[PDB]
Ligand binder design. Structure first.
Ligand SMILES: Cc1cc(N(C)[C@H]2C[C@@H](O)C2)nc(C)n1
Ligand SMILES: Cc1cc(N(C)[C@H]2C[C@@H](O)C2)nc(C)n1
Length: 460
């Protein structure tokens, strides 16, 4: 039985509005409704992994697991295995996988982050799951961010607290947050970003939605505009939105948006908005293709509609050679020429690099770089030809070209990372000097860049 080089992943997000679901929710898992929908000819084909995020979920874990597993069994005739389930208040994540994957999945991790302080600590935050699927690390985050049209900055703050403090994936990757720990990271939820148009334009917005004319609405979507200004979700992707706003509906129909201010809303308007979203970030030059992104039309218990997204995701096998794991493979090496970091810091300490990768027996510290001043004020840290030669555990190009090197630039004075990035070994050539580049981030904000050349030797 061959190991897969691709899997498909279902991501669902649904703010259930504290109400039990209706008796049939299969349209969600089938990616049917509005937007980019799944072909009918695939309806009996199970996805490999289903990841379900709920918010305002009134059900017990047991109650929701029974509904999810029975739904999938009805669709696919497969009894899925529960990989993980984690709940913070009424925010929940469930991971289900086909039984054939049970012995491909390991290192399962769950965590949560509570956002806000005093007043604002008590119902918002995130839950997440990570695991290995054969040689590939997968992370999943379900967040319920701060509500309200005039709180986009709070949402952005909630995002940074979540990516700083959610403790998923390999703890040995200590300089790295969740935005660097996984081959594929999916972040979804009721992100709560709104269409920022004047309240007086509510009926105009509704008209546009009825005409399926979303362009003048999406140009005011706060998540797209905050992302375009690099205020949130730097380096994450989102499929184009081609479905109507998923909030705020009258319950038991989808014929009406309920936008007007009410005591129950704190006297706030809820103009129709794309609150419910799926984004991803995958390492450079790994296969990831969104094959559906939409909302259901026939699940009406909540004031939100469920959102679905599906992905093809490249995966790798758990590689064993005669040499590594358990030793190095002398026919392999990774070399670095003409390398330098450009940092935005106003500080003057020495810096060194750390290289982390599951192709190395353990992480590698460089010598300190040489600081110079950039012609536009920057700190440039020069490594020239001084970086260590990295010794991979396996030299076989079918393994090594699929790997990635995480880079942290660290202060000599404090050993704190000032920037983190990732370099793919999926090169155009081996034994050839080739340009490399990554942006550097810290707490998910841009802090600099790392560029230079690489020379990769494999056994071929
Ligand atoms: C908790 C945890 C650990 C982990 N490790 C150690 C990987 C096994 C592979 O050899 C590196 N990976 C993930 C995704 N999570
Ligand atoms: C090259 C590139 C561009 C980009 N853009 C323009 C986002 C659309 C959102 O409005 C800003 N996002 C990413 C992740 N990469």
């Amino acid at each position: 039985q061959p190991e897969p080089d691709m899997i498909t992943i279902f991501i669902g997000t649904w703010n259930m509005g504290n109400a039990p679901p209706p008796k049939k929710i299969t349209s969600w898992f089938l990616s049917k409704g509005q937007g980019k929908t799944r072909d009918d000819s695939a309806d009996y084909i199970p996805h490999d992994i289903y990841v379900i995020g709920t918010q305002e979920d009134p059900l017990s874990e047991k109650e929701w697991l029974e509904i999810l597993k029975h739904s999938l069994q009805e669709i696919t005739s497969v009894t899925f295995k529960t990989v993980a389930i984690h709940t913070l208040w009424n925010i929940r994540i469930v991971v289900l996988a086909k039984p054939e994957h049970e012995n491909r999945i390991s290192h399962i991790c769950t965590d949560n982050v509570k956002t806000g302080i005093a007043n604002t600590l008590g119902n918002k935050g995130a839950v997440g799951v990570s695991f290995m699927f054969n040689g590939t690390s997968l992370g999943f985050v379900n967040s319920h961010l701060t509500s309200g049209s005039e709180k986009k900055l709070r949402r952005n703050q909630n995002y940074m607290n979540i990516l700083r403090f959610l403790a998923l994936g390999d703890k040995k990757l200590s300089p790295f947050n969740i935005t660097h720990r996984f081959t594929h990271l999916f972040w979804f939820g009721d992100l709560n970003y709104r269409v920022d148009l004047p309240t007086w334009e509510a009926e105009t917005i509704i008209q546009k939605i009825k005409q399926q004319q979303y362009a003048d609405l999406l140009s005011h979507d706060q998540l797209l505009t905050e992302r375009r200004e690099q205020k949130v979700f730097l380096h994450f992707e989102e499929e184009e939105i081609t479905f109507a706003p998923t909030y705020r509906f009258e319950r038991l129909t989808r014929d009406k948006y309920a936008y007007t201010k009410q005591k129950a809303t704190g006297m706030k308007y809820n103009l129709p908005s794309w609150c419910d979203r799926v984004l991803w970030k995958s390492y450079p030059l790994v296969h990831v293709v969104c094959q559906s992104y939409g909302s259901t039309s026939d699940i009406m218990t909540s004031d939100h509609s469920p959102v679905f997204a599906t992905f093809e995701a490249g995966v790798t096998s758990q590689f064993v050679s005669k040499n590594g794991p358990g030793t190095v493979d002398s026919q392999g090496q990774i070399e670095f020429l003409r390398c330098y970091a450009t940092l935005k810091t106003k500080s003057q300490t020495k810096f060194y690099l750390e290289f982390h990768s599951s192709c190395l027996e353990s992480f590698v510290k460089s010598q300190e770089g040489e600081n110079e001043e950039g012609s536009e004020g920057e700190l440039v840290v020069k490594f020239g030809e001084t970086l260590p030669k990295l010794k991979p555990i396996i030299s076989d190009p079918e393994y090594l070209l699929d790997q990635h090197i995480l880079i942290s630039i660290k202060s000599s004075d404090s050993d704190e990372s000032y920037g983190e990035g990732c370099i793919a070994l999926r090169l155009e050539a081996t034994e050839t000097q080739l340009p490399i580049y990554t942006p550097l981030t810290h707490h998910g904000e841009l802090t600099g860049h790392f560029q230079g050349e690489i020379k990769l030797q494999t056994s071929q």
